[PDB]
């Protein structure tokens, strides 16, 4: 299933905005 | 699960 490979886009965005300037 | 898993970002803001 193509949609069995789609949840990484859902799962990956939380670790994006952790720390860049502090 | 896709919709309600996102709202932890607003949970971080007010702490």
Question: Could you tell me which residues come within 8 angstroms of residue B2 by beta carbon, excluding any fewer than 6 positions away?
Answer: A10
Q: Are residues A14 and B9, on separate chains, in Cβ contact within 8 Å?
A: yes
- Header resolution in angstroms: 9.6
Q: Are residues B9 and A10, on separate chains, in Cβ contact within 8 Å?
A: no
| CA B10 – CA A3 distance, rounded (Å) | 27
State how far the alpha carbon of B4 is from the alpha carbons of A21, B7, B9, in Å.
Answer: 28, 6, 11
| CA B1 – CA B15 distance, rounded (Å) | 23
Residue carrying structure tokens 């952790």: A18
**Experimental technique of record:** cryo-EM
Interface test with B, best of A4, A6, A10 (most B CBs within 10 A): A10
Q: Does A17 touch chain B (CB under 8 A)?
A: yes
DSSP state of B11: H
């Amino acid at each position: 299933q193509k949609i069995g490979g789609i949840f990484i886009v859902l799962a990956a965005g939380l670790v994006l905005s952790v720390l860049v300037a502090v | 699960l896709a919709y309600l898993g996102v709202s932890v970002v607003l949970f971080v803001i007010a702490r």
